[PDB]
Amino acid sequence: MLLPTLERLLERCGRPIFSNVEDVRMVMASLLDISAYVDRASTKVIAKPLRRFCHKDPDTVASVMEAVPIDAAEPTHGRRAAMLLRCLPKHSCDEVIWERAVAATLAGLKSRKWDLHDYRVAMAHAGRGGRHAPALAAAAEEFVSSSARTASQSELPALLVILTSLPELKRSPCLQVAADRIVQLSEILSPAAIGQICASVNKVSFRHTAMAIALQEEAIRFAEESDLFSAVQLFSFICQQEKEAISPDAVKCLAERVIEGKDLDQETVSVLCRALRSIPRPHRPELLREIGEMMEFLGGEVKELLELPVAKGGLKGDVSAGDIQSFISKFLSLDGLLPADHDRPGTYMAAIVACVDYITERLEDIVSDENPPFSIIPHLLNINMEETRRCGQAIIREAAEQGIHFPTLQVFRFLLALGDHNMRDQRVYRHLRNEF
Amino acid sequence: HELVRVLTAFARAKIVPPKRFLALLGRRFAVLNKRKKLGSLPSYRAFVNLYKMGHDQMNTFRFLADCILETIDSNIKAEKKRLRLAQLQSDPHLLQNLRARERFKRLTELKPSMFTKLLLVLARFGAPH
């Protein structure tokens, strides 16, 4: 009957009200002890403040762990070993606590007495750092194996999320075993879980052709049952596969499903751009229509994101040069997909103009970064549009304005572009001559 | 010029800020030079300060040398264009030495000894002749 009072205290403890170090230590210890007797619905309610405290004061976490040891003989303790791994900061956490948590996780895996959801919550955050005990994955290579042949459709994501936690797991044969078990349950689909499977498996470049054929076999069902996130993850994983596995007709239904997604995170926009870029060349002539129709609204969405304020997920006050450069580079490589003579899908060039005017409104600061996106200059110049070459001219002119020293190969490439597109500016000419 | 004064104050303090701080200051010098051009003498002072405080990054030295040379060649081109416009419209040893020194100081905004030590520093760093 303590759920309302405890949840109220959890909500209130986020602010710095308690002014005593020992009070904070006791509150953290009590929260760690009591997190083992709540449901998953309240799990985040414990995690969000504690994590903040763990971000605020990682030093007291050692004393909290000393006050509350971890025992692997109780199922309820699983959340205890799952929350803390998320609570500890990825980079601003000391090594001692991380090693102790790693040892506790290894003990819990050896126990095999814990709940699968607890294993998910523990390992999905233990794989964030993976700094110590490289044998973990190898030990995990056995932990998954015991559950390799018993994981159901709703239990496969539990094992796979663990399987994609560490780089040392990128060569685990248990991934192939999981693919074989997916073959065992190919026809049986879970629209909410298949997206999680695709999101987990995209990290590893592994390709099992038969499983992908199975996933794209029932794209008629996925037209309605699959959600937008599941649709984009499945589409990326499918196109990433080999040419033989890809069914040209089947991939059309996923593309039609992803049409009209409205509010989409820019990360999934980048994922879709990479997905279009990772389609085999022989299949492109049969799917120009699909690339074009995806192009149409991808341009609109990126334009909206550029106009949208950064607060709601836009780039109005974008300062991350390394991020905008990657986003725009993927966007223009998506243009590179189409044939030169092929007429660009409508309302896409409007997004191109939006991109160029946004990149021209902020020019001094973009070049001012330690690594300015000079590499975006070829991407602009590969497009047969006057505005793109004009923007490249402006960028090189701004670079001349700073008088930034250039490596000789970059000077030669810029001179090659100068000769190729027959630009007529003089300041660029003088600076390039001086640099050469 | 405020950044130049800041660097001079740090040099007087005999305290070396982090390398990334000096790199940021040099990049701000590069950015701000368009709106307000930086003089040759402040450029020389900043060059001496940056060399003394162990700033390894050669890009700032390249930028400072470019800032000096652009002013020098602009002044030379200005005097040559004045002479060309004029022609289109149309102890003595000690005195000659003084006139040459005055002309050099007018063109370079710097004493000959400091110009020669700048050239020696550039030669030591391996710049092309």
């Binding site: 490596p407 190969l409 | 390894d56 050669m58 890009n59 760093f125 391996g126 710049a127």
Partner: peptide, 30 residues
Amino acid sequence: NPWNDGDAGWRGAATGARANRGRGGFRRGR
């Protein structure tokens, strides 16, 4: 030389002149 700043340049570039001064047979392949 500090002015090079870790840039081999033309002496360490990929130009045909630099690629034409070795006898390996190009068997393994880059």
